[PDB]
Motif scaffolding. Structure first.
Motif, PDB file in Angstrom:
ATOM      1  N   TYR A  83       0.801  -1.199   0.000  1.00 14.79           N
ATOM      2  CA  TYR A  83       0.000   0.000   0.000  1.00 14.79           C
ATOM      3  C   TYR A  83       0.843   1.262   0.000  1.00 14.79           C
ATOM      4  CZ  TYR A  83      -3.996  -2.995   0.602  1.00 14.79           C
ATOM      5  OH  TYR A  83      -4.909  -3.978   0.473  1.00 14.79           O
ATOM      6  N   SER A  84       2.110   1.110  -0.313  1.00 19.15           N
ATOM      7  CA  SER A  84       2.999   2.237  -0.303  1.00 19.15           C
ATOM      8  C   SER A  84       2.589   3.313  -1.364  1.00 19.15           C
ATOM      9  CB  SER A  84       4.432   1.716  -0.508  1.00 19.15           C
ATOM     10  OG  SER A  84       4.602   1.461  -1.853  1.00 19.15           O
ATOM     11  N   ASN A  85       1.883   2.919  -2.422  1.00 17.59           N
ATOM     12  CA  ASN A  85       1.357   3.887  -3.387  1.00 17.59           C
ATOM     13  C   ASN A  85      -0.027   4.415  -3.016  1.00 17.59           C
ATOM     14  OD1 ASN A  85       3.560   3.538  -5.142  1.00 17.59           O
ATOM     15  ND2 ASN A  85       2.573   1.877  -6.279  1.00 17.59           N
ATOM     16  N   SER A  86      -0.562   4.014  -1.864  1.00 16.09           N
ATOM     17  CA  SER A  86      -1.884   4.500  -1.380  1.00 16.09           C
ATOM     18  C   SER A  86      -1.725   5.179  -0.007  1.00 16.09           C
ATOM     19  CB  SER A  86      -2.873   3.340  -1.268  1.00 16.09           C
ATOM     20  OG  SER A  86      -3.124   2.746  -2.527  1.00 16.09           O
ATOM     21  N   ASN A  87      -0.670   5.953   0.114  1.00 18.86           N
ATOM     22  CA  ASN A  87      -0.367   6.635   1.335  1.00 18.86           C
ATOM     23  C   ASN A  87      -0.116   5.724   2.497  1.00 18.86           C
ATOM     24  OD1 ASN A  87      -1.321   9.757   0.620  1.00 18.86           O
ATOM     25  ND2 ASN A  87      -0.093   9.429   2.498  1.00 18.86           N
ATOM     26  N   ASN A  88       0.469   4.555   2.219  1.00 22.15           N
ATOM     27  CA  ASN A  88       0.748   3.585   3.251  1.00 22.15           C
ATOM     28  C   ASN A  88      -0.469   3.216   4.093  1.00 22.15           C
ATOM     29  OD1 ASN A  88       3.332   2.433   3.411  1.00 22.15           O
ATOM     30  ND2 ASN A  88       4.184   4.529   3.722  1.00 22.15           N
ATOM     31  N   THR A  89      -1.642   3.256   3.490  1.00 23.05           N
ATOM     32  CA  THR A  89      -2.865   3.079   4.227  1.00 23.05           C
ATOM     33  C   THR A  89      -3.710   2.084   3.511  1.00 23.05           C
ATOM     34  OG1 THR A  89      -2.859   5.325   5.062  1.00 23.05           O
ATOM     35  CG2 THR A  89      -4.918   4.230   5.150  1.00 23.05           C
ATOM     36  N   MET A  90      -4.042   1.008   4.222  1.00 25.87           N
ATOM     37  CA  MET A  90      -4.825  -0.070   3.676  1.00 25.87           C
ATOM     38  C   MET A  90      -6.294   0.118   4.002  1.00 25.87           C
ATOM     39  SD  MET A  90      -4.683  -4.125   4.466  1.00 25.87           S
ATOM     40  CE  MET A  90      -5.629  -4.217   5.971  1.00 25.87           C
ATOM     41  N   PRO A  91      -7.130   0.318   2.978  1.00 26.29           N
ATOM     42  CA  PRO A  91      -8.575   0.367   3.217  1.00 26.29           C
ATOM     43  C   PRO A  91      -9.121  -1.010   3.680  1.00 26.29           C
ATOM     44  CG  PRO A  91      -8.178   0.378   0.857  1.00 26.29           C
ATOM     45  CD  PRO A  91      -6.795   0.456   1.550  1.00 26.29           C
ATOM     46  N   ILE A  92     -10.109  -1.002   4.573  1.00 26.82           N
ATOM     47  CA  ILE A  92     -10.684  -2.227   5.124  1.00 26.82           C
ATOM     48  C   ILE A  92     -12.203  -2.189   4.912  1.00 26.82           C
ATOM     49  CG2 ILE A  92     -10.928  -3.688   7.243  1.00 26.82           C
ATOM     50  CD1 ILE A  92      -8.311  -2.392   8.214  1.00 26.82           C
TER      51      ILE A  92
END
Lengths: 11, 320
Positions: free
Chosen positions: B62-71
């Motif tokens: 998720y490094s290309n998604s602001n280091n943030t994993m959607p759940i």
């Protein structure tokens, strides 16, 4: 001649 | 809103399985119920913290998604959404943010179920680790055991080809479609002659993999390992590890893209193990990312005893 493999996973 | 961990209580905590092989897509799950003791408002939130040994994302990057994993949204007992959730890769913390749901209720009850995977970097060797998980400032203790399929694999002969690899990150969220893969060239640290390595973006049929390997799609860095016994089982490898000596520059005109979807590397006569870090891309066909690395060589003394070894990678996705 031979081989194997591995596999990963995530969410 | 405010952090309301003191107002939330988790119970019926369960870990699907306590032992698995993360190199064979082994993972586990955590499930729990929670209840809000007090009244809370929309925007308030509670958290869960994974320990060193675990990650909520595994080999999805998720490094290309602001280091943030959607759940996926967290539900009440009644089936409506109570909280929207987010996982932070850096702090390994889930944040469950209450919605307007909570504004007209009391005695709110919910439950969640979330996949859990190894942390390849913090649990790099097979063995047992503390898997103590923190939910709403409370500890739920466990022991995790990883039986990694050994990366040390090859033809069973002192001069036999040997190589392995693992796809450790796939970006399926941002649209950029990148992947990171570790290849261990000559992990048995044999003395091999005229060694070639092929990194393919597919296995047996080009049309069956979304992998895309080329001079514009792929970047490779090559490291000469000093002490092989330090190498991980998880396939994690630190490019700034002092046990790795970068030799990418020496391979500058020894890497060829003579074939489609394939990177050919001329190692020559070698006596040390190498780490090749691959940053690649896969296409938009919706096909699985399926790879294969091949090493071939001969005996460095007799130029006979030809040998060749292949290794397949592919990953799976889990849901909560």
């Amino acid at each position: 001649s031979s081989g194997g493999g591995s596999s990963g996973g995530g969410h | 809103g405010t952090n309301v961990n003191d107002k939330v209580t988790a119970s019926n905590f369960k870990l699907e399985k306590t032992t698995f092989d993360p190199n064979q897509s082994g993972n586990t799950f955590m499930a729990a119920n929670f209840t809000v003791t007090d009244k809370v408002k929309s925007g308030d939130y509670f958290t869960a913290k994974l320990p060193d040994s675990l990650t909520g994302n595994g080999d999805v990057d998720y490094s290309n998604s602001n280091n943030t994993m959607p759940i996926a949204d967290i539900k009440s007992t009644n089936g409506d959404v109570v909280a929207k959730a987010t996982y932070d890769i850096l702090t390994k913390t889930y944040t469950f943010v209450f919605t307007d749901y909570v504004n007209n209720k009391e005695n709110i009850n919910g439950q969640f179920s979330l996949p859990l995977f190894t942390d390849r970097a913090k649990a790099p060797k097979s063995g047992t680790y503390d898997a103590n998980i923190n939910i709403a400032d409370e500890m739920f203790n466990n022991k995790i055991t990883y039986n990694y399929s050994s990366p040390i694999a090859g033809i069973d002969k002192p001069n036999g080809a040997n190589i392995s690899s693992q796809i450790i990150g796939v970006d399926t969220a941002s649209g950029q479609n990148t992947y990171k893969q570790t290849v261990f060239v000559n992990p048995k640290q044999r003395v091999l002659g005229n060694t070639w390595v092929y990194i393919k973006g597919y296995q047996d049929k080009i049309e069956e993999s979304s992998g895309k390997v080329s001079a514009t799609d792929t970047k490779l860095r090559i490291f000469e390992v000093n002490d092989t016994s330090k190498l991980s089982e998880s396939y994690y490898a630190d490019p700034n590890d002092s046990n790795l000596k970068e030799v990418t520059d020496q391979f500058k005109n020894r890497i060829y893209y003579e074939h489609p979807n394939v990177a050919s590397i001329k190692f020559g006569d070698i006596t040390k193990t190498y780490v090749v870090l691959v940053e690649g891309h896969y296409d938009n066909t919706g096909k699985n990312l399926k790879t294969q690395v091949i090493q071939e060589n001969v005996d460095p003394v007799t130029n006979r005893d030809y040998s060749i070894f292949g290794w397949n990678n592919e990953n799976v996705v889990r849901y909560g």
